[PDB]
Design a protein around this ligand. Structure first.
Ligand SMILES: CC(=O)N[C@@H]1[C@@H](O)[C@H](O)[C@@H](CO)O[C@H]1O
Ligand SMILES: *[C@@H]1O[C@H](CO)[C@@H](O)[C@H](O)[C@H]1NC(C)=O
Lengths: 52, 438
């Protein structure tokens, strides 16, 4: 027994383990993007997604 | 009528569209790609498997001479040996001091269990793609299955629907493939007629039960050096077994786009890449005249709350004033957002809700209810749960992630130095002339 990390793709990932059927897991964004009417460090959000 | 549309190639993602004709209300049109089917044409090259070294008992010519003779059996090897002295449980088999000679030969044949353990080589080319479509219009559903080639239509209710061709060709299969026991492997098997011991394709037969075999596996006989009778043969390890040991991972765990590959047709299925252009023809009877179509007056949006979620989580409400009880279609003509239901009931002054999925935080677009459009906008926040397996990106991002506030800041940032330089030059020339007056 252990713990394993997996960099899920931005568009999807397959997961096979044991003899049972696999599962597909995809991802989206979760950084704090939109401001709240006051000055904000929005860039950090766009740095988390599409850093380049 | 005929309408063209481009649909992403992906299962379980309905695509909504309309068709506009004067005097006819819009006809909601849903297209769903039930399952893809990429089937390439293949040619059987040969079959191989673990072999078995037949060793018929040596010929013995006693107290005289003998000569070797070749045969047509696979990997046939023959060799004579003089000065041999066969001995057996009964004692000396025959008698002359070194004048006798024994001939030993060996050959190779497929093992009986091969009948289930065989591995077949194949050459594949000219991948072709078959699409199953389900089309819904006017609460009437039709099913169809068509080649992606855009010259052959699908047959369903004597209706013709052309599809394709693919925008970008994709085929996980390589030129040379090898299939064994229901598993596909990507491998460059040696060409037929060319063997190499200790590697795949050491034994090759045109068919599993072919009397003619061709194979070389480096069988070399050894001179008997024991009292009794015994033919010692030295041979290289079977190639098929060594390929089995280090065959690597199969093609299931390597094919991109998650293609589910099945063997008996040797085809990939249910996997997504590229786009498909499709033209749909609709019988005229399907359309309904606008005279009987409900008419909406004074339509207005309201975004109760929106979430920039991968799944379908955004909400919307519409308030309308109409005059006739009936049903009309609904749609969102901006690609960034996709609605959920296409047709809805209408009342004199009722209001109705809708669920929609977006892909940009600034959810601002034109939604067409029944016969009339309506612009409306709102802001959506990113979701807390940032991993899900459900359908995602019903529309791809189109650099629309920029918010309205970001655009406002960018506009307020850029300065009009061009006007400053122009004014500076104008005042410069004016002052230059004034001084030139002196
Ligand atoms: C004993 C017999 O049957 N044959 C041998 C032969 O193998 C050997 O080469 C020779 C002397 O070199 O003497 C004899
Ligand atoms: C399909 O929509 C039309 C238009 O309102 C309606 O008259 C018809 O009853 C509907 N069909 C079904 C099966 O609901």
């Amino acid at each position: 027994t252990t713990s394993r990390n997996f960099s899920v793709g931005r568009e999807g990932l397959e997961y096979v383990w044991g003899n049972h059927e696999p599962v597909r897991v995809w991802a989206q964004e979760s950084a704090p993007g939109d401001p709240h009417g006051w000055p904000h460090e929005i860039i950090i959000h766009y740095y988390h997604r599409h850093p380049v | 009528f005929e309408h063209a549309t481009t649909v992403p190639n992906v299962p379980g993602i309905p695509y909504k569209a309309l068709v506009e004709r004067a005097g006819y209300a819009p006809l909601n049109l849903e297209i769903t790609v039930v399952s893809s089917e990429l089937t390439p044409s293949t040619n059987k090259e040969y079959v191989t498997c673990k072999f078995h070294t037949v060793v018929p008992s040596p010929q013995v010519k006693c107290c005289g001479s003998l000569e070797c003779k070749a045969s047509s059996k696979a990997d046939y090897t023959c060799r004579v040996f003089g000065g041999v002295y066969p001995f057996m449980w009964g004692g000396a088999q025959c008698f002359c001091d070194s004048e006798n000679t024994q001939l030993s030969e060996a050959y190779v044949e497929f093992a009986p269990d091969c009948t289930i353990d065989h591995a077949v080589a194949l050459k594949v080319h000219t991948a072709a793609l078959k699409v199953g479509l389900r089309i819904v219009y006017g609460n009437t559903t039709a099913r169809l299955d068509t080649f992606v080639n855009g010259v052959t239509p699908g047959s369903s209710r004597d209706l013709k629907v052309i599809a394709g061709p693919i925008s970008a060709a994709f085929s996980p299969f390589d030129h040379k493939v090898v299939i064994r026991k229901g598993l596909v492997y990507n491998y460059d098997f040696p060409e037929y007629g060319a063997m190499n011991p200790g590697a795949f394709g050491d034994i090759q037969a045109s068919s599993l039960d072919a009397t003619d075999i061709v194979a070389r596996t480096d069988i070399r006989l050894l001179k008997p050096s024991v009292k009794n009778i015994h033919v010692p043969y030295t041979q290289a390890v079977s190639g098929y077994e060594m390929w089995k040991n280090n065959s690597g991972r199969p093609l299931q765990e390597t094919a991109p786009f998650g293609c589910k590959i099945e063997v008996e047709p040797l085809r990939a299925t249910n996997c997504a890449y590229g786009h498909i252009p499709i033209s749909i023809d609709i019988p005229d009877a399907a359309f309904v005249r606008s005279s009987e179509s409900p008419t909406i007056l004074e339509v207005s949006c309201t975004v109760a709350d929106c979430i920039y979620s991968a799944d379908f989580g955004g909400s919307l409400t519409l308030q309308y004033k109409a005059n006739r009880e009936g049903h009309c279609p609904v749609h969102s003509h901006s690609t960034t957002a996709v609605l959920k239901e296409a047709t809805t009931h209408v009342t004199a002054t009722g209001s109705i809700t809708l669920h929609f999925s977006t892909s940009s935080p600034q959810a601002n677009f034109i939604v067409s209810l029944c016969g009339k459009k309506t612009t409306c906008n709102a802001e959506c926040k990113p979701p807390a749960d940032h991993i899900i397996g459900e359908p995602h990106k019903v529309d791809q991002e189109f650099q629309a992630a920029v918010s309205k506030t970001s655009w406002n800041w960018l506009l307020a940032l850029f300065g009009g130095a061009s006007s400053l330089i122009v004014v500076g030059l104008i005042v410069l020339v004016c002052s230059s002339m004034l001084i030139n007056t002196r």
